[PDB]
């Protein structure tokens, strides 16, 4: 009885019971999201943890064999990449103390609590009450105060959470002789053991720190234009030679500055056209929104959904007489079951959100050959990598004009396209200054690098050296930032959104492999692309058996990622910015402040 035969004669039973536990948990995970009843609250969480009630003692009984002489790397990629190390190693009281602080770091933070400290007659919360004053205002009694209003109300309450959660990770990291507890987040990223087609252990700095050096010259092209776009209703506080405040977000945490497009509308009270709501006069339903979503997959060649898809999915809103939630989530319940959950209505703004998420379940039917041990993304970002590629492929002119929404009486004019290209200018970069100041905080600080005297005094000057967005009110240690974020409160690693924007264009450049078009690159559609018919069929079925390192070699063969395929698609946008830096602020001042 060799260990190689032992591995398969345990893992076959393991995946056979794992798909059964996955479906028994997915039934409780889906029937709650459509039927909110008080019995369903009791009946979803006991059965969603029934998959965990088997796994919390079965994974220890799965790696009870050490797998010392395993010669097939498939079952070793099955077992060793999913080593559930936890409370069975160190303690059960400290782990339940971490579970206790997880109750106050995520549930109390959820939906927020903002009370007005000036007058008790105004009972207004974050979304009910501050947004209608945020939308239209002219004076500065509340607007510059609105950023630090969260620091004065909630930012002082999250003070015991800042220290113990970052000094627990050194005790958490020393379990299985690994250098970091971020290696548990990097568990799918540690891929050493194959010949050449992985990333080396000494190549980690070369993998991470070097890829940001290419997009930084593209940030200064818009840092001299969008900064000067505040000359509408910003008096006597921000000079055009200085920088931006921190209350231009749209929400309280504000992880992107993409929402500045609504600030720079030239004619707000007089719209030029509206090509989005051209569905309303012909009055299509929510069915034809979904019939064309797989016809977009028929035109590229991807197969249609099963016959059990158009009856179990969410196509009509249940309302309030049948209590339900409207969280847009794709679903792969396993064993050939494919359905989705989305807030479908009569409107047209859900069309782009539907076409962004329709590629998720098409990806879910791509890895249907291997069992549940490999039925995920090769990294955290490949679940939405194919969803973000076709997220911008739905608003194309060859898809929108061909169905009959544009007016045939209007002649082709080249001067009216000044406002059509202004919408996508702030989408691609507007969250990237948020990426690199979060990339430095929690990577190599837990091995004895941050003592008790530089908890947050290392945190504050990272916001103005490279990012630039300056604080309007000075702070101290009582003004804790990262307990206010939405992704930090459930310890989400921000590595998938760093590789999200990069890994799209390597396959977005393969749609037009002959001469990049029959002309300019204002149009791009996959309507009858037989060269892209069987092109992406061998791209997507591999899953995890070949890892995230060489998942980009199926059609091109590139070793790493560069932003050189981002040059040809943004040609009306890059020549709109290269001839602009003539009168804005040159360089950067490290001590400029608006107070």
């Amino acid at each position: 009885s060799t260990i190689e035969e032992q591995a398969k004669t345990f893992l076959d039973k393991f995946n056979h019971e794992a798909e059964d536990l996955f479906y028994q948990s997915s039934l409780a995970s889906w029937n709650y999201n459509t039927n909110i009843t008080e019995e369903n609250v009791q009946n979803m969480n006991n059965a969603g943890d029934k998959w965990s009630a088997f796994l919390k003692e079965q994974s220890t009984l799965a790696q009870m064999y050490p797998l010392q002489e395993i010669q097939n790397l498939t079952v070793k990629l099955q077992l060793q990449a999913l080593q559930q190390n936890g409370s069975s190693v160190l303690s059960e009281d400290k782990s339940k103390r971490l579970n206790t602080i997880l109750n106050t770091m995520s549930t109390i933070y959820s939906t927020g609590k903002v009370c007005n400290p000036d007058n008790p007659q105004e009972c207004l919360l974050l979304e009910p009450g501050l947004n209608e004053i945020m939308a239209n205002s002219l004076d500065y009694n509340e607007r510059l105060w609105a950023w630090e209003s969260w620091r004065s109300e909630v930012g002082k309450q999250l003070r015991p959470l800042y220290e113990e959660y970052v000094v627990l990770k050194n005790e958490m990291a020393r379990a299985n002789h690994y250098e970091d507890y971020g290696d548990y987040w990097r568990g799918d990223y540690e891929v050493n053991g194959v010949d050449g087609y992985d990333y080396s252990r000494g190549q980690l700095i070369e993998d991470v720190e070097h890829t940001f050096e290419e997009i930084k010259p593209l940030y200064e092209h818009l840092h001299a234009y969008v900064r000067a776009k505040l000359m509408n209703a910003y008096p006597s506080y921000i000079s055009p030679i200085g920088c931006l405040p921190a209350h231009l977000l749209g929400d309280m945490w504000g992880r992107f500055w993409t929402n500045l497009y609504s600030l720079t509308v030239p004619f707000g009270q007089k719209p030029n056209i509206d090509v989005t709501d051209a569905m309303v006069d012909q009055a299509w339903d929510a069915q034809r929104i979904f019939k064309e979503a797989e016809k977009f997959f028929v035109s590229v060649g991807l197969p249609n959904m099963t016959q059990g898809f158009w009856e179990n999915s969410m196509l009509t809103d249940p309302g309030n007489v049948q209590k339900a939630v409207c969280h847009p989530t794709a679903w792969d319940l396993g064993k050939g079951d494919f359905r989705i959950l989305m807030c479908t209505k009569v409107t047209m703004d859900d069309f782009l959100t539907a076409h962004h998420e329709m590629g998720h379940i098409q990806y879910d039917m791509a890895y249907a050959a291997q069992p549940f041990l490999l039925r995920n993304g090769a990294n955290e970002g490949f679940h939405e990598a194919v969803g973000e590629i076709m997220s911008l492929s739905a608003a194309t002119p060859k898809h929108l004009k061909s169905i009959g929404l544009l007016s045939p009486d209007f002649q082709e004019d080249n001067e009216t396209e000044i406002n059509f290209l202004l919408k996508q200018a702030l989408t691609i970069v507007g969250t990237l200054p948020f990426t690199y100041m979060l990339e430095k905080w929690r990577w190599m600080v837990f091995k004895g690098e941050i003592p008790k005297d530089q908890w947050m005094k290392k945190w504050w000057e990272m916001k103005r050296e490279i990012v630039g967005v300056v604080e309007p009110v000075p702070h101290d240690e009582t003004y804790c930032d990262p307990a206010s974020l939405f992704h930090v409160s459930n310890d989400y690693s921000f590595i998938r959104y760093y590789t999200r924007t990069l890994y799209q264009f390597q396959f977005q450049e393969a749609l037009c492999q002959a001469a990049k078009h029959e002309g300019p690159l204002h149009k791009c559609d996959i309507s009858n692309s037989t060269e892209a018919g069987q092109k992406l069929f061998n791209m997507l079925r591999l899953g995890k058996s070949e890892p995230w390192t060489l998942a980009l070699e199926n059609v091109v063969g590139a070793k790493n990622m560069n932003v050189r395929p981002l040059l040809n698609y943004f040609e009306p946008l890059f020549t709109w910015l290269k001839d602009q830096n003539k009168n804005s602020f040159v360089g950067w001042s490290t001590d400029w402040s608006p107070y």
Binding site: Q6, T9, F10, D12, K13, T306, G308, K335, G336
Partner: protein
């Protein structure tokens, strides 16, 4: 078989063999449930861990996709022996002119 062998509560009646160390020969029925195991022991006790008994079960629920929704398969194997032929196809007739 869609509305024939599908239970919402669970169709655990149809059992099958997931593990068998011996390979097969045609027309062999295997109904003896000798307890398979991966440990060098004669399965101490009656069952439990490290005694993965070969009988498993199915979990047919009436909303699966194709490939997992259950099918009913029957094979009609024909043989020609030295005995006289007793089963044969139909022989249609005509009118009497």
């Amino acid at each position: 078989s869609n509305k024939l062998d599908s239970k919402v509560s669970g169709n655990y009646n149809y059992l099958y063999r997931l593990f068998r160390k011996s390979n097969l020969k045609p027309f062999e029925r295997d109904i003896s449930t000798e307890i398979y195991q991966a440990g060098n022991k004669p399965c101490n006790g009656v069952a439990g861990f490290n005694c993965y008994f070969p009988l498993r079960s199915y979990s047919f629920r009436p909303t699966y996709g194709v490939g997992h929704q259950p099918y009913r398969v029957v094979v009609l194997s024909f043989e020609l022996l030295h005995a006289p032929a007793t089963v044969c196809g139909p022989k249609k007739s005509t009118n009497l002119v």
